[PDB]
A paper describes a structure:
The male abnormal 21 (MAB21) like proteins form a sequence related subfamily within the large and diverse family of nucleotidyltransferase (NTase) fold proteins. Here, we provide the first crystal structure of a MAB21 protein and the structure of [name] bound to CTP. [name] is a two lobed, globular protein of a mixed α/β topology with approximate molecular dimensions of 64 Å × 35 Å × 48 Å. The human [name] structure exhibits a high degree of structural conservation with cGAS but features a number of differences.
We crystallized native [name] in space group C2 with unit cell constants a = 167.7 Å, b = 177.6 Å, c = 115.6 Å, β = 126.5°. The native crystals contained 5 molecules in the asymmetric unit and diffracted to a limiting resolution of 3.05 Å. The crystal packing of [name] is unusual and consists of an intimate assembly of ten copies of MAB12L1 into a decamer, formed from two back-to-back stacked pentameric rings. The pentamer interface is composed of hydrophobic and some polar interactions between the N-terminal helix α1 of one monomer and the C-terminal helices α11 and α12 of the neighboring molecule. A citrate molecule from the crystallization condition stabilizes this interface. The citrate is coordinated by residues R344 and K340 from one monomer together with K14 and K354 from the next monomer in a very basic surface patch. During model building of the [name] structure with no nucleotides added, we observed an additional electron density not associated with the polypeptide chain in the ligand binding pocket. However, we were not able to identify by structural or mass spectrometric methods the nature of this low molecular weight ligand, which may be a buffer component or have co-purified with the protein from E. coli. The fact that the structure of [name] without any nucleotides added shows density for an unidentified molecule in the ligand binding pocket may support the suggestion that this positively-charged site acts as a binding site for an acidic ligand. Although the equivalent region of [name] is ordered in our crystal structure, it notably does not adopt the α-helical NB-loop conformation.
Author numbering: 0 to 54, 64 to 87, 89 to 99, 102 to 141, 145 to 174, 180 to 215, 228 to 359
Amino acid sequence: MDIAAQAKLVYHLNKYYNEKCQARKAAIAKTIREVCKVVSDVLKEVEVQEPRFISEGLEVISPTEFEVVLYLNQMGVFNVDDGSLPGCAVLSDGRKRSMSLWVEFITASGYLSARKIRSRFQTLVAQAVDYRDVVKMVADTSEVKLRIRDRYVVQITPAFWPRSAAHWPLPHIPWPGPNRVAEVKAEGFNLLSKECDAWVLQFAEAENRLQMGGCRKKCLSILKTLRDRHLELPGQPLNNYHMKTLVSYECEKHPRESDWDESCLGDRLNGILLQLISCLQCRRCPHYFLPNLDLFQGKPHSALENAAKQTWRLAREILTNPKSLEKL
């Protein structure tokens, strides 16, 4: 009897993925196509004032929030991760300051300033917005953020293998195979100009590729969707990034690709919600690549607890009656 309920769960989850998850990616695509015209148009204007800025590398934060990473024409004339500041990193010799496309922006100390490029970029964006009612500029934040049609918020973050991520993959876990490891590692990493004077690290390119195989993406698509529909809560305790970062952890716990067959979608999804409820209750949720930073950092105890209540309540309605997914 325990066999048939596993299959019923996998069936209704596939319906959720095809009915509700696809609808998400459809509404998001409508919202992104509307948003992306505004940004690329504005970015075209920034290109005429500053040609170094140019118009793929997108990030969905929520259905209404996005982060555009703008990959700048670089020279990489500058060569550095230390325990100094967690999750964030920062030239070689006192020569070749004139080698950078952004040569003016290297500091007197000889370091290259994220704070200064983002300000220069922010001044340009706030100026380009002056269009009437459809675009707004977000202030009191160091990062560039636009408010479009008073409905959506888009952050535009200037952007281009690390010391903390060096352990991964630990040869302990058969996953990933040497083929998947070197393949995902070739993606490299990205540095995002955000506050913490440092650059934020992001592996959205490696993370999303690491989860290739099996139902991992269907699981993420289902997790992101459930979060949108039922876990947008006071305190914004839960992000698409929380789900994304958990799916990777569950990949380790179940190393074998067989654990990720389509038959196992219910198990892996159920396993992930539970680990999430633990993270909420334990009050700690670590980054996949960098354990030193906790993605619950700064979250109120009241909100982390309530999120645990709703996440738990959600998994039970699912298991007791998996058809309940239709009405979710």
